[PDB]
GROMACS .gro file of C-alpha atoms in nm:
model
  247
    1UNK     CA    1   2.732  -1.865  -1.795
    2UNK     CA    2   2.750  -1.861  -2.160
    3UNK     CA    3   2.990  -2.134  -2.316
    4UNK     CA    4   3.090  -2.093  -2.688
    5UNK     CA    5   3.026  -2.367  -2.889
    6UNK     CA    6   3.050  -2.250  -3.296
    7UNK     CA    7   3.336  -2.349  -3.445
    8UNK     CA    8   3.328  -2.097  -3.705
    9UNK     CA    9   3.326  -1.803  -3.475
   10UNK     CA   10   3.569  -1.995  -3.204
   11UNK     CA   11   3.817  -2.034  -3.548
   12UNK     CA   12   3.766  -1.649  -3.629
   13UNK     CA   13   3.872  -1.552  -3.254
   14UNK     CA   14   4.201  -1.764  -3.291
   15UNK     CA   15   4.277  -1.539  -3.597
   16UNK     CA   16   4.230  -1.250  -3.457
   17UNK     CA   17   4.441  -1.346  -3.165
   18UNK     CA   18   4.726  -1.513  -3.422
   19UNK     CA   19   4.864  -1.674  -3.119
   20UNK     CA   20   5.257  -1.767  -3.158
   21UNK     CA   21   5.433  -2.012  -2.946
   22UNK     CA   22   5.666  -1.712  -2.890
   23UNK     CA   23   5.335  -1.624  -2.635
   24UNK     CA   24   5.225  -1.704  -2.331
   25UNK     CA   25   4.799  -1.659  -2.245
   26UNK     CA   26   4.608  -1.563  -2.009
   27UNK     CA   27   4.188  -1.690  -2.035
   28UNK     CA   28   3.986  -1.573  -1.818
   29UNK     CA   29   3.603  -1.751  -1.847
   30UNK     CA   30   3.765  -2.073  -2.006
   31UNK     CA   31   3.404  -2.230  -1.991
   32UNK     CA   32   3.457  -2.555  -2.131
   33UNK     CA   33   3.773  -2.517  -2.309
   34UNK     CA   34   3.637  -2.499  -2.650
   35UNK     CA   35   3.859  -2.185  -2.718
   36UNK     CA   36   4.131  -2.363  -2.516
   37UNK     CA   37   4.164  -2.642  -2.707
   38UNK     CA   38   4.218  -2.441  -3.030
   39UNK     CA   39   4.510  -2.233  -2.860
   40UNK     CA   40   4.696  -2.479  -2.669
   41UNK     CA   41   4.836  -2.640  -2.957
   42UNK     CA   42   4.945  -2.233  -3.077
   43UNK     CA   43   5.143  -2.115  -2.780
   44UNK     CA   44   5.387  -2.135  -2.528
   45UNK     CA   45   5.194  -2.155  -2.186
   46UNK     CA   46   4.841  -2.134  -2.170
   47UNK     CA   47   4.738  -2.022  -1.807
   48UNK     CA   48   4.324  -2.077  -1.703
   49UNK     CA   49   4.205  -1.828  -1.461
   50UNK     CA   50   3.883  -1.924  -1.328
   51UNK     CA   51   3.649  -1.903  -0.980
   52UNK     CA   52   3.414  -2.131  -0.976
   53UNK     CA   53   3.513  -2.465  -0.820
   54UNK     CA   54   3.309  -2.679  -1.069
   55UNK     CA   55   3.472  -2.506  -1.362
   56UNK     CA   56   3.815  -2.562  -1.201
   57UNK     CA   57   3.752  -2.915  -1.131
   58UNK     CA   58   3.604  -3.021  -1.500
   59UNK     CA   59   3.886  -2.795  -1.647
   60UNK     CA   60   4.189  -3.013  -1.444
   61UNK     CA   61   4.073  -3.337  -1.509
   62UNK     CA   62   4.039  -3.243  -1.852
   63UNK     CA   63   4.365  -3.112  -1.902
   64UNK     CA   64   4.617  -3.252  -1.608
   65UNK     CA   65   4.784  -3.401  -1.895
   66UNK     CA   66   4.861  -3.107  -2.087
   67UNK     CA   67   5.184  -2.986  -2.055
   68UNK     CA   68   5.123  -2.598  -2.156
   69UNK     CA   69   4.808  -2.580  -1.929
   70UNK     CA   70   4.786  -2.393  -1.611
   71UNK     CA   71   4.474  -2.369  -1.406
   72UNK     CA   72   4.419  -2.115  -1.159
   73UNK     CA   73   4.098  -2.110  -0.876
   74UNK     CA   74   4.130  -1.782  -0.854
   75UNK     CA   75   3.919  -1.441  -0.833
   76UNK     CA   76   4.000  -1.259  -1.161
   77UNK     CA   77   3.899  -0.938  -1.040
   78UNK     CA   78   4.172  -1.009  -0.786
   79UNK     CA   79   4.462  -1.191  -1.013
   80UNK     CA   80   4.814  -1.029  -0.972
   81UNK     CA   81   4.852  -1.103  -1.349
   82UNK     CA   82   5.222  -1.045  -1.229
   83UNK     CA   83   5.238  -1.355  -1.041
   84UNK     CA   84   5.276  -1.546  -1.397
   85UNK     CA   85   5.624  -1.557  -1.405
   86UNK     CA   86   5.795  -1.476  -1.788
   87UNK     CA   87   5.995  -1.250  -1.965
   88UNK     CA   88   5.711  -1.128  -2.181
   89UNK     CA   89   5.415  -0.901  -2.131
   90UNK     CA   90   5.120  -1.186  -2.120
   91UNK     CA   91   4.821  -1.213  -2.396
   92UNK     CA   92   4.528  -1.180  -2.252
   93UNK     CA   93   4.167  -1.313  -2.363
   94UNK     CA   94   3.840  -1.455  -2.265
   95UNK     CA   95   3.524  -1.426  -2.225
   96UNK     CA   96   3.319  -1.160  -1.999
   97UNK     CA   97   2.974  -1.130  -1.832
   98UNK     CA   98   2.820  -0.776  -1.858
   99UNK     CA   99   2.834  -0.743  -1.472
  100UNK     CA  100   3.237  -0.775  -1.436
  101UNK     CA  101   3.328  -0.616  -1.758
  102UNK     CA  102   3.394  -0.268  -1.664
  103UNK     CA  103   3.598  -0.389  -1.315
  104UNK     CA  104   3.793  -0.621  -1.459
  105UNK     CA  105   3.891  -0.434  -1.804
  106UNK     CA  106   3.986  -0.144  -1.534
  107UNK     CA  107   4.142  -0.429  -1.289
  108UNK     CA  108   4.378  -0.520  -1.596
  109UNK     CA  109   4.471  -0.136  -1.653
  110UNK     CA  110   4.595  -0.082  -1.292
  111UNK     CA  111   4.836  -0.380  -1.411
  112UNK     CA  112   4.903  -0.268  -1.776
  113UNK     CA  113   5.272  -0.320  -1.805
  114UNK     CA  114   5.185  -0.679  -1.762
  115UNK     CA  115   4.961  -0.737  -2.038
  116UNK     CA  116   5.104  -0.725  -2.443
  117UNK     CA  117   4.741  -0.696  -2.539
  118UNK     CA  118   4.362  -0.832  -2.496
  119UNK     CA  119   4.111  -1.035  -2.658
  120UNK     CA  120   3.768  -1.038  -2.522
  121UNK     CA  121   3.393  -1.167  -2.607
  122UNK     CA  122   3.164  -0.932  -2.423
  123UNK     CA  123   2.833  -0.785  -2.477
  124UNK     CA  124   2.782  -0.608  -2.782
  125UNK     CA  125   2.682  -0.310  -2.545
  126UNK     CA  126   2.998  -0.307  -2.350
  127UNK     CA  127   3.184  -0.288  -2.698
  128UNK     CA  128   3.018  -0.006  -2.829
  129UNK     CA  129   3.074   0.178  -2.480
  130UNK     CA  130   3.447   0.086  -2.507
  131UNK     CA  131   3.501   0.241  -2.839
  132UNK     CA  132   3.230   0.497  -2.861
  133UNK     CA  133   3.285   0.840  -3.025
  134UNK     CA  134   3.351   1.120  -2.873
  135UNK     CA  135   2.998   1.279  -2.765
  136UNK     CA  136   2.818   0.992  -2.808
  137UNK     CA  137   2.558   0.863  -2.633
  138UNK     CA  138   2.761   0.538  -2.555
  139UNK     CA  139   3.066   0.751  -2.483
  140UNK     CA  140   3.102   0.757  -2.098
  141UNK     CA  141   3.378   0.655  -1.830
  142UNK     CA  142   3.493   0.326  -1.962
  143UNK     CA  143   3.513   0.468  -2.319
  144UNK     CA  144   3.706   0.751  -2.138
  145UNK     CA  145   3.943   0.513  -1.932
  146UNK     CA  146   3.961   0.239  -2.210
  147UNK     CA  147   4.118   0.502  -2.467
  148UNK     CA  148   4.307   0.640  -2.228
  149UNK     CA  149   4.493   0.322  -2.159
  150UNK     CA  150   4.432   0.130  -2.502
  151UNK     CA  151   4.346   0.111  -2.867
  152UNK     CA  152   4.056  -0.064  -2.930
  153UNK     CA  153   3.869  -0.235  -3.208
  154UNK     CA  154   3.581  -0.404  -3.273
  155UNK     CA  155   3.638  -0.665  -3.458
  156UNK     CA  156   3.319  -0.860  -3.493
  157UNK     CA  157   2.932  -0.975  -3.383
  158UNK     CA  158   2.881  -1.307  -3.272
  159UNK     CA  159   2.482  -1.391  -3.229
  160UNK     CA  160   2.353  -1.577  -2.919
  161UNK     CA  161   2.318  -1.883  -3.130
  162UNK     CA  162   2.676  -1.952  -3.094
  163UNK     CA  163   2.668  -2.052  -2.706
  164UNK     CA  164   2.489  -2.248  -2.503
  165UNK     CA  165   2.301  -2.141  -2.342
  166UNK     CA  166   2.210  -1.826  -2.524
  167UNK     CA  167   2.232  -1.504  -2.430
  168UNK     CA  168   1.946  -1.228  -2.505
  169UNK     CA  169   2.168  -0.991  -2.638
  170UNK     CA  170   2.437  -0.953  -2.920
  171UNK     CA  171   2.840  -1.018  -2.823
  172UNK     CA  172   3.090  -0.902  -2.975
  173UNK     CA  173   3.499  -0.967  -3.005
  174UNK     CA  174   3.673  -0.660  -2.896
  175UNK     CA  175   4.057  -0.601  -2.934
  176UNK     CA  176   4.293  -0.360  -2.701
  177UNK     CA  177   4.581  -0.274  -2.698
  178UNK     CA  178   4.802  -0.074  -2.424
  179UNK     CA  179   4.880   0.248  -2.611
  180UNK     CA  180   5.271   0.436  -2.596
  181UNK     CA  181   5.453   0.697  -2.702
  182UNK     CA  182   5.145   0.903  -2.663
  183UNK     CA  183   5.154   1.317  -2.519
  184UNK     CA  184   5.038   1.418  -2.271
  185UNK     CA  185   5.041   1.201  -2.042
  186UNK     CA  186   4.852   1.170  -1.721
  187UNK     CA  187   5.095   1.224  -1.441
  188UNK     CA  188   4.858   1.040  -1.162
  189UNK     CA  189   4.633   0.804  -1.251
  190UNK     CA  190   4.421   0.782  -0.957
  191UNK     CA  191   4.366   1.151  -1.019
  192UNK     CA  192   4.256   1.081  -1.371
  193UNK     CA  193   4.002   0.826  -1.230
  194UNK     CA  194   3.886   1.024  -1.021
  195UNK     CA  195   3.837   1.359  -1.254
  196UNK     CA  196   3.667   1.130  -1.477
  197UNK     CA  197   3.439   0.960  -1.216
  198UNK     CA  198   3.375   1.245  -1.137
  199UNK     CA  199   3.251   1.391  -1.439
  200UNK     CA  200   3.047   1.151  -1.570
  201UNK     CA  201   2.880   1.043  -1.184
  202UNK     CA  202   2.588   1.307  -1.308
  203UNK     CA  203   2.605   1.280  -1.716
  204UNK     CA  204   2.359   1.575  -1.725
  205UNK     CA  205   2.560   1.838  -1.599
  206UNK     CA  206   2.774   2.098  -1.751
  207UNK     CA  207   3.151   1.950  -1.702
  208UNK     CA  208   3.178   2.295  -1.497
  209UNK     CA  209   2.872   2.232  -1.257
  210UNK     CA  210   3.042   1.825  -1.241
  211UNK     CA  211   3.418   1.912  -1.179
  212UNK     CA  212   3.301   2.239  -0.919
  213UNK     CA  213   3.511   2.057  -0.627
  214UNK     CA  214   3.814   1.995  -0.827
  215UNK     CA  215   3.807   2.318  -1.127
  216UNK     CA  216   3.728   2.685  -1.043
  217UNK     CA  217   3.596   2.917  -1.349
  218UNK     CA  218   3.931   3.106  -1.377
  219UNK     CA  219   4.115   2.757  -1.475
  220UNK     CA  220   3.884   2.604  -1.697
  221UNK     CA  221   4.062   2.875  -1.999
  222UNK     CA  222   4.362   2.774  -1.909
  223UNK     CA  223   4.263   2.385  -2.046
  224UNK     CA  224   4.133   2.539  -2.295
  225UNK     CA  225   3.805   2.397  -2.242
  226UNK     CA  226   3.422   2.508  -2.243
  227UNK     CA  227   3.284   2.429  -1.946
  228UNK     CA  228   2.961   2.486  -2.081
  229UNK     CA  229   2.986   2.204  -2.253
  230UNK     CA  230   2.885   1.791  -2.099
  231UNK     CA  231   3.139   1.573  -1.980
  232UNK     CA  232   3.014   1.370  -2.291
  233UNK     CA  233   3.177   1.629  -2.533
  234UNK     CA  234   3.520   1.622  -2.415
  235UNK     CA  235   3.779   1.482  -2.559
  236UNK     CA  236   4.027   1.174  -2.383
  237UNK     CA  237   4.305   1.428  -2.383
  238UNK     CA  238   4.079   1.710  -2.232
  239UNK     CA  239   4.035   1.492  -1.908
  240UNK     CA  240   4.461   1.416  -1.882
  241UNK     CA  241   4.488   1.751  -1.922
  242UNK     CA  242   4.204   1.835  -1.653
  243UNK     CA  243   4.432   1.590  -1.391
  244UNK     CA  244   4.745   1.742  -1.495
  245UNK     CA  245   4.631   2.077  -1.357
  246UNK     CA  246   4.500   1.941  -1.016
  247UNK     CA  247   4.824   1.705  -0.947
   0.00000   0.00000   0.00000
């Protein structure tokens, strides 16, 4: 575990953020509380998810006093972000180890009309998978899934000197946010999982030779796609409409 401990870059996240006390929060990986204790004083209802027993118990007596503080023993990977009762999509932020990145960001998808928007630290890598161009080398199926579901932004770098302990690697703040109003849409979103698990299980391949099982050669012209081409090279839209056509 990583705890941040610089001020400076702990300050800069609660800018980003701009938390109101119109909101209500959602931390996952509250470590110590040092982000904590700069956004309980900005919001409504500040609600710790957390699963290690240690961390729970350090967090409650520290904060059993606080009136906006919730703490939660709970698997995160597992939270029904549902179960915090308000009116209000929830803000959610935190801080992420490489390993559970990918399942919970996609965790917090399969719940998106519960969350206004996120807030994470996670490995620099992660973040430059998230928002990678199309055809890029870091573009792959969370950059695929991410944009499908969200916006997102990097926002910043944060070097391991800010935590203790250090990590080896860079971090980085990342922003998304649940896109609307957006066409087409994916009808099923299992199916779009699965097209796009699919596609990028063997990144190698022709999209053609990956999607065999699901596409035939007479359909491919009808998406108006090259199948010649790798998964890699298509477009966030390209895979909806790849779903759409199997649904």
């Amino acid at each position: 575990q990583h705890f941040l401990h610089d001020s400076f870059v702990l300050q800069k996240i609660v800018s980003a953020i701009h938390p109101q006390k119109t909101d209500t929060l959602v931390e996952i990986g509250p470590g110590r509380g040092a982000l904590t204790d700069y956004l309980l004083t900005e919001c409504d209802n500040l609600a710790l998810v957390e699963i290690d027993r240690d961390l729970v118990a350090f967090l409650q007596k520290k904060y059993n006093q606080q009136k906006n503080i919730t703490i939660y023993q709970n698997d995160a990977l597992q939270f029904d972000f549902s179960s915090v009762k308000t009116d209000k999509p929830l803000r959610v932020v935190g801080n992420l180890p490489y390993n559970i990145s990918t399942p919970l960001l996609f965790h917090l998808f399969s719940q998106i009309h519960c969350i206004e928007d996120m807030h994470f630290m996670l490995q620099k890598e992660v973040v430059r998978r998230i928002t990678a161009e199309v055809g890029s080398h870091d573009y792959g199926r969370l950059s695929v899934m991410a944009q499908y579901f969200c916006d997102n932004t990097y926002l910043f770098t944060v070097s391991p000197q800010a935590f203790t302990p250090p990590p080896r690697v860079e971090s980085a703040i990342i922003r998304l946010i649940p896109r609307h109003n957006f066409t087409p849409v994916a009808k099923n979103l299992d199916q779009l999982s699965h097209v796009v698990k699919e596609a990028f299980s063997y990144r190698r391949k022709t999209v053609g030779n990956a999607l065999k099982k699901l596409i035939n050669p007479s359909q491919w012209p009808l998406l108006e796609i090259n199948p010649q081409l790798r998964p890699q090279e298509l477009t966030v839209e390209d895979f909806v409409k790849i779903s759409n056509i199997l649904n």
